[PDB]
Design a protein around this ligand. Sequence first.
Ligand SMILES: *[C@@H]1O[C@H](CO)[C@@H](O[C@@H]2O[C@H](CO)[C@@H](O)[C@H](O)[C@H]2NC(C)=O)[C@H](O)[C@H]1NC(C)=O
Ligand SMILES: *[C@@H]1O[C@H](CO)[C@@H](O[C@@H]2O[C@H](CO)[C@@H](O)[C@H](O)[C@H]2NC(C)=O)[C@H](O)[C@H]1NC(C)=O
Ligand SMILES: *[C@@H]1O[C@H](CO)[C@@H](O[C@@H]2O[C@H](CO)[C@@H](O)[C@H](O)[C@H]2NC(C)=O)[C@H](O)[C@H]1NC(C)=O
Length: 616
Amino acid sequence: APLLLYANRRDLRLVDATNGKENATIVVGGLEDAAAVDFVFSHGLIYWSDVSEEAIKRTEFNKTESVQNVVVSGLLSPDGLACDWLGEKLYWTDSETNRIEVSNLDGSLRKVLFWQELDQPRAIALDPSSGFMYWTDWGEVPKIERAGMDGSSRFIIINSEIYWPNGLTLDYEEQKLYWADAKLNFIHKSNLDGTNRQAVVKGSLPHPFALTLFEDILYWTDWSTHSILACNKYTGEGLREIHSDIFSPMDIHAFSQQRQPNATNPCGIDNGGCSHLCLMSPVKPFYQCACPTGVKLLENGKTCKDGATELLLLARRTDLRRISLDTPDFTDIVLQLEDIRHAIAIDYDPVEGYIYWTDDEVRAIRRSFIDGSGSQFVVTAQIAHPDGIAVDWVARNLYWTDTGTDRIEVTRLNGTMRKILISEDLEEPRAIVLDPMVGYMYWTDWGEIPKIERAALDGSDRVVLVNTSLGWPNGLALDYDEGKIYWGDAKTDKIEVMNTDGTGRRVLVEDKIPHIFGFTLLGDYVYWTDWQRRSIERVHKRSAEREVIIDQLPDLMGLKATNVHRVIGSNPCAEENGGCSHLCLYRPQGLRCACPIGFELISDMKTCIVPEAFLL
Ligand SMILES: *[C@@H]1O[C@H](CO)[C@@H](O[C@@H]2O[C@H](CO)[C@@H](O)[C@H](O)[C@H]2NC(C)=O)[C@H](O)[C@H]1NC(C)=O
Ligand SMILES: *[C@@H]1O[C@H](CO)[C@@H](O[C@@H]2O[C@H](CO)[C@@H](O)[C@H](O)[C@H]2NC(C)=O)[C@H](O)[C@H]1NC(C)=O
Ligand SMILES: *[C@@H]1O[C@H](CO)[C@@H](O[C@@H]2O[C@H](CO)[C@@H](O)[C@H](O)[C@H]2NC(C)=O)[C@H](O)[C@H]1NC(C)=O
């Protein structure tokens, strides 16, 4: 007696028994807007997607409430879902992020398979027997596609006689795959190639939402009629509708251990396949090696590197995000954090892996471990508009500018030992970069006469690098072992370059530049945000040519491209803090020790104490 399992927006539901007594059972319930479901029968698992919650979840078939969030991020319209009961993976399409991804059956090791040339991928079917997954994307040009469940050999099989190509489901007995259509109202049938395209229920009668099958019988949903239907597997004949008065049936599968034929796993329980991901494959070994998103795989294969090497950190108004720079996929942003109101500037310290960022409604500076409970505060007092921040990764101090108080200030990374280095009456400091070797700190500031200044790392030797033809200078990156210094200006709308001493100057490209501007350099490439702050460009600094790695991401505020772990340069401050008891600030001549407000430097030129304290 084939049990049918189907989503229903408000709940998941199991029905049929032997098609009698109308025992539709509410498997899970109290959902909000469920679309897709699937199961791994052996383990008694039921998965679904929820379009209002943008999450994918799972439960235990037994009498239990047990529900676990499985994906809860990066999803917009997950409308297709397929479990791999063999290789033990989870696949799912997302019709709006136009991605196709995979994970372990617990949401972990989440790899994006495909992401290019996808228009509204929906229905999805796995063939773990072979290494083939099938899905349908439809849009300006609809099509059914095949590829390996490993990301290989993406083949377009059926690309004609289709419009809104509908549910996918395969006959393992016959090595044929069926598909429907939500517009042209047919059911068809082919070989697992694009081959032998036969009609099973041609003619405009079927208006199926989701197809399944079990022993010669095609079942499906017609949301319109609020019904479930069924007919011969071989012709349209037999077309009765199973008992069905059902409130918006969506996705549906035959809930039967026979619809998942088990077999030999291309990796054993041995190996566990690789180090992170063993995905099935048509390729000779019949399994393939994978790392999570943005993570590259060693030349040996089978072993994934540790995390990404470079990394592009985003600051939106109300979240932070990182895009990796190790892989082609890019547009895999991923985010984190709570209580972020209005983020402005961002920077990072590869040594301890803390992200630092400014928020100018909260008026505070904070740090985190990326996707880590890193989150502590750092500064919260006497702040206005922290429009720019710089980590000094050698002396282990944190610099930040302020627009409201027109100051530059330094603290140790933990926000201790605060000390005002620069405080100008007219001009007001905006964007800031550091050179802990060579001992310089450069910064743009706006004002009645907008200039670009520089100084030693303690504010001492103020030199005005740029003075003329600058309206509102914005971003300000630094090319180190090339001694150039890139910046932007919102008013004039052109990205210029320069010699480290303010001489090699020249427009690089023209550009319409936002007032709040993200702008950073790393490895021949420059990254900035567009005028509408919904997209990020990658530009060759040596070659001048542009490109857009990610759009449709509003409220972009500030960017930082950075190595993870990797660090470069040094100076004597790295030696037990220069010998200074509090603040050690490097200069071209040589480091100078400093003190928090109220303290006093003793003739050591190394030590601070609070005056009128002791008598010694
Ligand atoms: C479930 O599938 C697995 C994987 O094929 C079966 O486990 C073993 O599979 C090998 C592969 O041919 C057989 O040689 C063994 O005989 C299988 N185990 C044994 C000793 O039964 C497993 O049999 C399948 N479960 C069933 C019974 O349906
Ligand atoms: C961050 O704060 C910690 C304590 O919360 C500081 O740790 C030591 O603090 C004493 C007291 O001034 C200093 O004499 C030590 O030099 C500090 N240790 C180190 C590692 O230098 C610390 O100074 C602050 N930031 C650092 C440097 O970790
Ligand atoms: C920005 O303008 C100031 C003031 O005009 C420049 O400072 C001096 O400018 C006068 C001419 O107006 C020169 O004779 C001096 O040589 C300048 N100062 C010195 C001694 O360097 C300042 O140079 C301008 N900023 C820059 C460097 O572009």
